[PDB]
């Protein structure tokens, strides 16, 4: 359909760009002006720059006129958008979407409907690294609480994700996965996923499979009482 | 650099009749913004194209008016699989403002979160850190506290909270504030209460315990 | 157990009204500088395979007429 790929997810330290191919798909090309926009989780959307696709029409947004350029691949219908001197406040999901092009001879749009997955992009100095899982895992049995929960504790690794599954995901009751909530000390975002078990399930051990891979690091823990 | 302000902040439902929701530009738009359906985690989609006539396979009832300032947007019967984000979006002024976000809940009823304090490990004693977890867990709404005590001393800033999505399930919520310490300064005390403060509880919930106790 | 700050002599400590006498050695009352209260104890060695057993020493000094019965568990 009238589709884009876009590719693909990297994240740049303050360096060089993370330009995006924005592969188009389904639909001709030279009648549709692709934009992108940029959001930042948790927050709102940042439209940032529309070519028109052919004769180019830059139309950068304001406070980075500038910093970003914008290319066109008319040859295999991908787009392209770069960043210059790259920053921490480029923690954004790079979408690319298509305005329509404000010629005479394209169709009437402006609502973007091609629209583009997204495109994990953080602006990131950490290192990639393993989680530091700390855990509790008790036996639900800590003062006297019937169900008494547990959970891990998945922290500093980079980059995202962890992937968490408890006892290889056999306990899916009580999984709460908290977010990565990143860290201002290093830049390795925190998580952890819990669950509630019940005392009585103080003879089982229950193992969350921290695992991330794109540090390609494996963790599995579980922790008891103290006698 | 027209200013989008939605007027509901966010919402919650528990599924049911019109959901109506609300969008005003800073001038005069005339019809010529759209609306859309950013769900978590995924790409945003279009709901409404230019301020109504339901763009391209929306199913029977998101309509929507307008024209042309304070924009409107209807979830008339409200099928509880479209709580997503939504946004209003201008387009025929640069540079292009979108709205604010417009998270949509369910409205089960207020509920206590089952307040849980874990302990640092050891093996975090074997890094040099600390790090005490509270829980909070199975609630709602998000409208809660949390009052860190370093035998009983109110703390807070080496705190990390962290807040789970709404619950297809049961609709609740999950906390956990992170108290990342020194070890030093874990050593320096015992008495680690968490004092959580959540409408669904009755109490400013103090949840504790001793460093070694566990 | 930690028989502390009785006057005057003496305690008589028992393990379960007697009934440990294994083990038993009375250490004599070590006599407080601070306040002229001297400290006795009385203790057992027992093995591991009794735990699911509370040890009462039956501490009862007659010359203030208190009688003191106790046991402490593990910290779960």
Redesign the interface.
């Known amino acids: 359909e009238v589709q884009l790929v876009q590719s693909g997810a990297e994240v740049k330290k303050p360096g060089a760009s993370v330009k995006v191919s924005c592969k188009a798909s389904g639909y001709t090309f030279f009648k549709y002006g692709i ?1 992108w ?1 940029r ?1 930042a989780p948790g927050q ?4 940032m720059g ?1 070519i028109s696709p052919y004769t180019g029409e830059t ?1 950068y ?2 406070k980075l006129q500038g910093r970003v350029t914008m290319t066109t691949d008319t040859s295999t219908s991908t787009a392209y958008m770069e960043l210059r001197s790259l920053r921490s406040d480029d923690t954004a999901v790079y ?1 690319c979407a298509r ?1 329509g092009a404000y010629g005479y001879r394209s169709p009437y749009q ?4 091609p ?4 495109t994990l992009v953080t602006v990131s100095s950490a290192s990639t690294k393993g989680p ?1 899982v ?3 895992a ?1 036996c639900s049995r ?1 003062t006297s609480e019937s ?3 547990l ?1 891990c ?1 998945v ?1 500093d690794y980079f980059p995202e994700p962890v992937t968490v599954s408890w006892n290889s995901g056999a306990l899916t009751s009580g999984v ?4 990565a ?1 990143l ?1 201002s000390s290093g830049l390795y975002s ?3 996923v ?1 669950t ?1 078990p019940s005392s009585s399930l103080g003879t089982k051990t229950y193992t969350c499979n921290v695992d991330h891979k794109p540090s390609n690091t494996k963790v599995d823990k579980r ?1 008891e ?2 006698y | ?1 027209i200013v989008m302000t939605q007027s509901p902040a966010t919402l919650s439902l528990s599924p049911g009749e019109r959901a109506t929701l609300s969008c005003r530009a800073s001038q005069s738009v005339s019809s ?1 913004l ?1 609306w859309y359906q ?1 769900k978590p985690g ?5 709901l409404i ?2 301020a109504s006539n339901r ?2 396979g929306i199913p029977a009832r998101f309509s929507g008016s307008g024209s042309g300032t304070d924009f409107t947007l209807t979830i008339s019967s409200l099928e509880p699989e479209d709580f997503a984000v939504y ?1 209003c ?1 201008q ?2 002024l ?8 417009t998270k949509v809940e369910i409205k089960r009823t207020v509920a206590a979160p ?1 307040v ?1 304090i ?4 050891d ?2 004693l074997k ?1 040099g850190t600390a ?1 005490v ?1 509270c ?1 909070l ?2 609630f709602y709404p998000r409208e809660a506290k949390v009052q860190w005590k370093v035998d009983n001393a109110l703390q807070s800033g080496n705190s ?5 999505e709404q ?1 297809s399930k049961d609709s609740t919520y ?1 906390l ?1 504030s ?1 108290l990342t310490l020194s070890k030093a300064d874990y050593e320096k005390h015992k008495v680690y209460a968490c004092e959580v403060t959540h409408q669904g509880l009755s109490s400013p919930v103090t949840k504790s315990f001793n460093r070694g ?2």
């Not at chain 2, 990390?160 to 789970?164: A, D, F, K, L, P």
């Open positions: 934009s926009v959001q709102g959307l940042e439209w529309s139309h947004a304001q979408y305005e402006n609502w973007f409907d629209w583009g997955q997204g530091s700390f855990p509790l008790p800590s169900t008494a929960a959970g504790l922290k709460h996965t908290f977010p909530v860290q925190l998580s952890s819990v509630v922790v009482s103290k | 650099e010529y759209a950013q995924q790409a945003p989609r279009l194209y230019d763009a391209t946004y979006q387009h025929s640069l540079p292009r403002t979108f709205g604010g976000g089952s849980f874990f302990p640092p490990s093996e975090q890094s790090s977890v829980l867990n199975n990390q909270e962290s807040v789970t619950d999950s956990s992170t106790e566990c």
